[PDB]
Amino acid sequence: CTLSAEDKAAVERSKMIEKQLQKDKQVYRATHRLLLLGADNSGKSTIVKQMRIGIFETKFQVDKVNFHMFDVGAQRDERRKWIQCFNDVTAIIFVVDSSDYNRLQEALNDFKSIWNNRWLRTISVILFLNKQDLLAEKVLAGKSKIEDYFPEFARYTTPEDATPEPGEDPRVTRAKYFIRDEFLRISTASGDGRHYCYPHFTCSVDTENARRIFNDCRDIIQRMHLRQYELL
């Protein structure tokens, strides 16, 4: 009530900055935040480049819904103690160099660390198995045999639920789905229904990566809320 001119100006500035904070709150609540984790080989750069249409942030709107995307390049190899801050991102986008056979086990270990993290226990992971064209090229020709790195591929058939893209021979489908289920095994092993993994085969040039992200985010939020309502 009884305020000095200085006090009046102070509370007036408080109200103005509160208004700006409210505008920022609507911006923030309606924008979905994604972490684009991945190894150096994994084409994180290609993914961000295609969807241009320290921490690196890329904005992209799909069907009039905002999406952050924070690449975490230029950081130490270890991820702990900065992954703790991404505990509130809607989804994590894990890109893996499916073509590079040798480091695939390192990618699996990385996915195990991210999945089985004390934090991130309520965050879904989108496995963009990037550069499937290169994997196709390498698996057609010899000189690169899965068994030399993952012996289990000899004893692996194509899942009955596989939906190969037309124009691809059976063996490329075999290899790609082998990698997919190699990730999913460590994904489904300790899901606990709190967070799920959404495998996707993708390439660098693919323009549908943003659409895949949009659909996956829809599914993630829907499943989370249905679990909250106990409908699922």
Binding site: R13, S14, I17, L21, D24, G54, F70, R76, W82, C85
Partner: protein
Amino acid sequence: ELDQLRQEAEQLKNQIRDARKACADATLSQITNNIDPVGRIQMRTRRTLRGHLAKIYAMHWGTDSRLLVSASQDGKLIIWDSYTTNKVHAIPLRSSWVMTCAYAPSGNYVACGGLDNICSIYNLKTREGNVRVSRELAGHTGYLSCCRFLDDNQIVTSSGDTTCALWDIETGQQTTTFTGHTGDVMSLSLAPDTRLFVSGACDASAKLWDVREGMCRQTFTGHESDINAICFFPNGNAFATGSDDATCRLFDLRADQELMTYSHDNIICGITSVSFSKSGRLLLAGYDDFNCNVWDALKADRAGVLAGHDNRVSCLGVTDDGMAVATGSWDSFLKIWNG
């Protein structure tokens, strides 16, 4: 020559530990037995600084002991007038993910940094308002874990890359680089006299450095997992270590040993922030279990507990005059406590 070098390193390590044992005469525990307790010291939230849209990750009181700064992971750096709760400012940061923030002792500048490896100095008194970035101190190769001002022209930063550095604001370059840590350095505390500063890191060690001389004087160990937080005793003779494994420990510089280990059986959470009250008898300690504990710095007993946050408390700024304890939290709220 690795064999001989490692043999020498082990020999000097044995020497230092033996010397520490030699100066390990009657521990602080028995000496503090003569000290009377502080009772069930308590304090109630006198203010609740709301306005942040996300997790609060760092705060710092200005020397006024009135204005404070806090950084939220949206990218908002709100400058709060603790007395009246008015928000003096809120800077839109270029990087949403801030992990630290500092207030210049003069109150003229406020610094912040995060997963972007850049310390952004924001000048508060310029152009008759419209606080705008003063200088982007880039050059670090990792996430800035803590920032602290020495004077209006000098700032010292700790980064995920195992290094701390001193930057001259105007010249915008690392006047000194404090390499030597084996892991990510998480927090650093300047001594009351700005000649020294102590930084704890993920390598399960704390290290004291001379700002002018530019090399490590002493290193300390004994805390198990990690150091999320580090603070100097108001005198500059000892510093308390807030560890990521259930223990807060107080180390003294000149004696150079673990003077005490504050911990209790029930608590399993890791310490996120640590600070002393003036006279240092009260070692406020923030925990992951959405609570802040009060530890008698000397008798090493839990003299109190603060509980008003729904989530992890990240920052535990104590006023320069010692008349308030501020507690940020991931719950987006910043509560000021006073007896």
